[PDB]
Amino acid sequence: MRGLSRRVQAMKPSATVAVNAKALELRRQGVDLVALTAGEPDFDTPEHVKEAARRALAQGKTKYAPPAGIPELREALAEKFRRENGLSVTPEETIVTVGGKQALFNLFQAILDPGDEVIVLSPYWVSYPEMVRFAGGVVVEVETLPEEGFVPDPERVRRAITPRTKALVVNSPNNPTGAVYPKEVLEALARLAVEHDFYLVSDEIYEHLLYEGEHFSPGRVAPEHTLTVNGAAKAFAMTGWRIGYACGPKEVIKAMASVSSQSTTSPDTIAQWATLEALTNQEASRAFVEMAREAYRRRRDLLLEGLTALGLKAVRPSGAFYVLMDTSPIAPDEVRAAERLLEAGVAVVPGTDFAAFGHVRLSYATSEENLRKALERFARVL
Amino acid sequence: MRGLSRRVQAMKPSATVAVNAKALELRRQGVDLVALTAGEPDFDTPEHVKEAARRALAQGKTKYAPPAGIPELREALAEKFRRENGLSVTPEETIVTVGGKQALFNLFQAILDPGDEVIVLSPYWVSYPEMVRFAGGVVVEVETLPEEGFVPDPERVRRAITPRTKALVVNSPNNPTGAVYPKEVLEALARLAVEHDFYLVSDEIYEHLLYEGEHFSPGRVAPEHTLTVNGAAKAFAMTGWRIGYACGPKEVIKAMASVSSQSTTSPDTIAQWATLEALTNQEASRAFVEMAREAYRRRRDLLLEGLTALGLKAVRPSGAFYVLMDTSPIAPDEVRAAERLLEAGVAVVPGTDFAAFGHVRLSYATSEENLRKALERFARVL
Ligand SMILES: Cc1ncc(COP(=O)(O)O)c(CN)c1O
Numbered sequence: 034m035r036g037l038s039r040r041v042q043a044m045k046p047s048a049t050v051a052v053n054a055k056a057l058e059l060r061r062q063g064v065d066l067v068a069l070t071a072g073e074p075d076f077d078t079p080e081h082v083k084e085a086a087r088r089a090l091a092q093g094k095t096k097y098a099p100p101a102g103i104p105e106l107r108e109a110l111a112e113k114f115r116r117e118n119g120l121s122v123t124p125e126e127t128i129v130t131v132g133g134k135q136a137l138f139n140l141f142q143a144i145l146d147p148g149d150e151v152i153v154l155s156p157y158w159v160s161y162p163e164m165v166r167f168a169g170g171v172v173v174e175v176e177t178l179p180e181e182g183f184v185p186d187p188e189r190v191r192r193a194i195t196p197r198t199k200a201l202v203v204n205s206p207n208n209p210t211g212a213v214y215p216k217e218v219l220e221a222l223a224r225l226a227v228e229h230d231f232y233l234v235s236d237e238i239y240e241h242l243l244y245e246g247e248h249f250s251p252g253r254v255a256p257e258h259t260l261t262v263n264g265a266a267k268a269f270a271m272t273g274w275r276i277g278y279a280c281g282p283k284e285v286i287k288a289m290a291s292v293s294s295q296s297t298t299s300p301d302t303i304a305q306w307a308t309l310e311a312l313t314n315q316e317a318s319r320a321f322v323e324m325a326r327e328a329y330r331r332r333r334d335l336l337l338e339g340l341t342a343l344g345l346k347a348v349r350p351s352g353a354f355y356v357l358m359d360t361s362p363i364a365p366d367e368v369r370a371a372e373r374l375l376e377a378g379v380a381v382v383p384g385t386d387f388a389a390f391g392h393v394r395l396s397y398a399t400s401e402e403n404l405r406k407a408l409e410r411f412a413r414v415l
Numbered sequence: 416m417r418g419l420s421r422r423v424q425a426m427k428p429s430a431t432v433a434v435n436a437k438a439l440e441l442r443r444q445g446v447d448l449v450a451l452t453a454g455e456p457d458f459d460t461p462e463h464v465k466e467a468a469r470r471a472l473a474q475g476k477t478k479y480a481p482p483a484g485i486p487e488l489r490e491a492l493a494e495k496f497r498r499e500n501g502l503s504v505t506p507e508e509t510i511v512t513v514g515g516k517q518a519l520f521n522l523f524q525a526i527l528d529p530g531d532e533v534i535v536l537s538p539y540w541v542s543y544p545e546m547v548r549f550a551g552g553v554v555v556e557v558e559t560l561p562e563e564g565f566v567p568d569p570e571r572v573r574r575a576i577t578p579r580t581k582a583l584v585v586n587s588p589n590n591p592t593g594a595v596y597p598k599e600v601l602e603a604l605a606r607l608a609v610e611h612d613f614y615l616v617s618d619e620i621y622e623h624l625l626y627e628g629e630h631f632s633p634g635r636v637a638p639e640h641t642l643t644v645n646g647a648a649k650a651f652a653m654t655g656w657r658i659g660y661a662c663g664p665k666e667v668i669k670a671m672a673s674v675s676s677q678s679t680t681s682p683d684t685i686a687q688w689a690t691l692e693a694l695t696n697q698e699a700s701r702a703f704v705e706m707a708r709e710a711y712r713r714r715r716d717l718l719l720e721g722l723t724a725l726g727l728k729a730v731r732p733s734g735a736f737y738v739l740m741d742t743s744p745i746a747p748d749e750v751r752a753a754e755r756l757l758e759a760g761v762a763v764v765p766g767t768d769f770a771a772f773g774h775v776r777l778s779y780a781t782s783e784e785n786l787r788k789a790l791e792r793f794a795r796v797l
């Protein structure tokens with residue numbers, strides 16, 4: 034017989050991706066709207082990275098790369114995790130994937146048997162629950178509170194652990210909250226994984242878009258229980274290049290490259306060499322990162338001051354480029370609230386699927402002009 | 416508890432990929448060996464395609480593309496399947512994936528429930544069985560005979576159909592056999608799918624590397640049951656670019672883009688624009704294709720004549736760039752036979768995992784010099 038599988042029938046395709054398409058299609062309709070839905074830098078990818086790509090193209094580096102990635106990138110990855118994060122990985126405990134998303138997807142497909150539980154901290158990124166269930170696992174949510182700055186309380190987390198717990202997913206800096214969890218809290222979560230024997234999956238793609246505090250890698254504390262996921266996407270404005278990377282226990286990494294060989298073979302060879310440049314050319318990349326960070330910081334402060342002045346509540350973010358705004362003043366719920374905003378000319382992502390009810394997610398990864406323009410419309414809505 | 420999943424523990428990572436790494440590492444050791452294991456063109460990707468890429472880089476086309484692919488490529492895809500294959504698809508029934516492999520992987524994840532059977536014709540490509548089982552399906556093998564030119568007998572196929580049959584996988588031109596199935600046989604297989612109500616998955620990536628006969632797309636006969644898989648990899652020497660495409664029933668295509676959104680988001684944006692050029696610039700691409708085909712043809716004939724002279728058997732291929740060679744004269748089995756050849760300085764892929772026992776797979780996608788050099792070593796082994 035014909036027909037789709039149950040797993041695909043159960044799955045929700047990316048909600049953030051979906052709302053972006055809608056806001057983009059509305060502008061084609063000539064509709065004047067300010068989109069605050071983007072989850073990607075407005076800056077183009079730095080020139081040094083583009084040159085590395087042109088150089089690869091010219092050198093004929095267009096053939097298949099190994100499932101785990103070109104050796105050269107793996108060595109630079111080992112160096113980056115070591116130098117920037119304190120992790121003691123070897124190139125063999127490193128892997129390159131089609132974006133950080135495929136690092137996570139291949140991760141779950143490699144460690145989840147049907148029924149295995151995965152603890153997810155809410156508000157969580159739209160994709161965690163979907164990937165966990167597509168692999169057959171069960172999502173166990175542990176709540177994070179705004180009054181606690183959206184930082185996890187390791188005690189609420191311990192109370193959600195069961196004999197079925199296979200993994201715990203931490204994301205700092207956080208999407209959609211923008212929170213940066215303290216070293217102490219991360220060490221605590223890392224200890225729970227060691228004590229109870231399960232995997233800590235640390236999603237660090239926003240590590241460089243930090244404005245206050247410091248970035249701590251739990252993998253320093255629990256090295257054989259931790260899988261660190263990262264990527265070139267946010268740090269270098271390389272979202273469309275599709276290059277992510279991860280490190281951790283050699284056996285899990287080796288399992289992940291196996292899934293890669295039977296699905297995508299390996300990521301784009303040109304994009305791989307381009308990324309090698311972003312990582313090794315420290316002077317040039319550090320320069321881009323410093324420049325983008327200060328621009329985002331400047332946009333964060335601008336946005337937050339405006340919300341405060343309009344009497345809209347929002348926990349002050351310390352990383353990433355998102356803000357969860359309490360929509361109570363606008364409507365009784367995020368869906369109706371997001372509808373009103375769209376009608377006022379501003380597109381936001383409702384917090385429904387992030388489990389951030391009563392809130393809406395804003396992105397300050399656009400021009401100051403757009404931010405100011407959005408703030409005016411918020412005003413009239415109120 | 417910690418531990419890998421049972422599905423990943425059951426899976427065999429790509430065998431062809433593995434033997435290539437070994438032959439490549441041996442040459443680094445300074446070992447003098449001729450590798451006939453490659454499954455990729457020796458030609459670099461044509462200039463027009465590289466230019467389209469440079470133009471995209473320069474225009475800042477580095478952001479996320481939609482899960483199904485940039486609209487422009489989908490429209491050109493609809494035009495290609497229509498113009499080149501006789502398929503009546505629309506852009507909405509088209510999808511771009513990270514290589515043809517992800518088209519197939521996402522396919523099976525979207526239509527296979529545990530226990531669903533998928534008929535696979537042997538010798539089959541190493542990855543079909545692995546992908547089928549990773550999604551929970553069961554592989555039902557239907558044998559193809561050398562004495563019948565490795566062309567499937569639709570009657571043996573009908574006798575393998577059961578109430579559990581969800582799909583049938585056809586691959587023409589074929590890897591590893593190089594056989595090109597006749598229009599009649601393809602129409603017959605397409606009818607079985609309609610009659611018994613199941614999916615026909617037609618893997619056509621080698622459509623342009625055809626030396627004798629014509630390429631028929633079964634999707635013309637059973638359009639609502641067929642999923643045509645293809646890619647830029649073989650036709651344009653774009654293996655490392657990771658761009659594949661497929662068309663078929665809108666609901667299945669839409670399910671495939673959903674899996675993409677929760678795994679890789681979308682393929683490389685730069686590689687997508689590069690591919691748009693390969694498809695629309697017909698004069699330039701047609702020129703590359705004609706040139707490469709005649710070079711492969713010239714290498715096929717060279718290889719085959721040499722085998723014939725050494726008294727080694729092999730069915731004469733009409734497409735792709737592989738040849739299944741009967742290794743009886745060399746050893747009692749492909750594994751021992753592949754071992755002897757390696758020591759004689761020639762690396763081949765044993766037919767074990769292709770279910771082509773007693774055979775070894777050779778690739779004539781290298782210089783005439785390499786082919787001649789390999790033929791000398793075959794001589795001394797005998
Ligand atoms: C929290 C989080 N983790 C992982 C990713 C993966 O990103 P990509 O596929 O673009 O690397 C994203 C995308 N922004 C993200 O927001």
Ligand SMILES: Cc1ncc(COP(=O)(O)O)c(CN)c1O
Nearest residue numbers: 514515516540590618646648659
């Ligand atoms: C029979 C067959 N089908 C599909 C593919 C997919 O190729 P790719 O991922 O490089 O597009 C290949 C690779 N050569 C193949 O041999």
